[PDB]
Amino acid sequence: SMLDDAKARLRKYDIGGKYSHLPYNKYSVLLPLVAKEGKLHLLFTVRSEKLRRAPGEVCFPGGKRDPTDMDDAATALREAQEEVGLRPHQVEVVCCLVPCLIDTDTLITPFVGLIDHNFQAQPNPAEVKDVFLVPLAYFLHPQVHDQINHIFEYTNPEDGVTYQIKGMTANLAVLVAFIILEKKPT
Numbered sequence: 001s002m003l004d005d006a007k008a009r010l011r012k013y014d015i016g017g018k019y020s021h022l023p024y025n026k027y028s029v030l031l032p033l034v035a036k037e038g039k040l041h042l043l044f045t046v047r048s049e050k051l052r053r054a055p056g057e058v059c060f061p062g063g064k065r066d067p068t069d070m071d072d073a074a075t076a077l078r079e080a081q082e083e084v085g086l087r088p089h090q091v092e093v094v095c096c097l098v099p100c101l102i103d104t105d106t107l108i109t110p111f112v113g114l115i116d117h118n119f120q121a122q123p124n125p126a127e128v129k130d131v132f133l134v135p136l137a138y139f140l141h142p143q144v145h146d147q148i149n150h151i152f153e154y155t156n157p158e159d160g161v162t163y164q165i166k167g168m169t170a171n172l173a174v175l176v177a178f179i180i181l182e183k184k185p186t
């Protein structure tokens with residue numbers, strides 16, 4: 001099946017907890033995969049304009065590890081719950097992708113999670129201005145704008161709203177699309 005095939009692909013790239021004990025300032029992100037209309041999508045947030053770091057930018061759910069977290073995956077799930085109401089029973093964490101090093105002292109660990117078909121986002125307005133889906137296949141043929149660095153523009157055909165996706169967020173989306181969608185029969 002589509003979902004079993006995605007999970008099998010994702011598992012081959014799982015680094016596990018290899019890098020997780022290293023003494024960094026630690027953040028986790030959840031790359032939430034949603035199946036709608038026979039296709040996989042990624043769920044993104046738009047960060048509230050109130051937030052000090054990167055207000056109004058497109059981001060994956062996630063945030064800073066805290067002492068309650070049993071592990072890095074727990075960080076991602078806690079933060080996703082806080083931001084979009086995703087409950088742990090509504091997500092299956094399939095793997096841990098390559099961590100992202102930033103600012104010399106920070107390590108961001110991404111987890112890919114399969115999201116339950118009955119999940120409905122409940123954006124928490126103190127953290128998140130918007131939640132939206134992008135079909136995973138979009139990231140194979142994105143609409144690219146150069147601002148000099150590359151920015152994706154995605155227009156939701158449901159409402160015509162255009163979102164700009166960039167940076168680590170755009171990078172991770174492409175990675176996940178390659179992993180899951182490369183070399184598939186039609």
Ligand SMILES: COc1ccc(CC(=O)Nc2cccnc2)cc1
Pocket residue numbers: 027028029045046047048059060061062063064083102106108127128
């Ligand atoms: C320092 O670099 C990063 C650290 C954390 C994150 C993830 C994140 O904070 N996501 C979020 C938070 C609030 C609302 N929506 C999404 C991304 C980059």
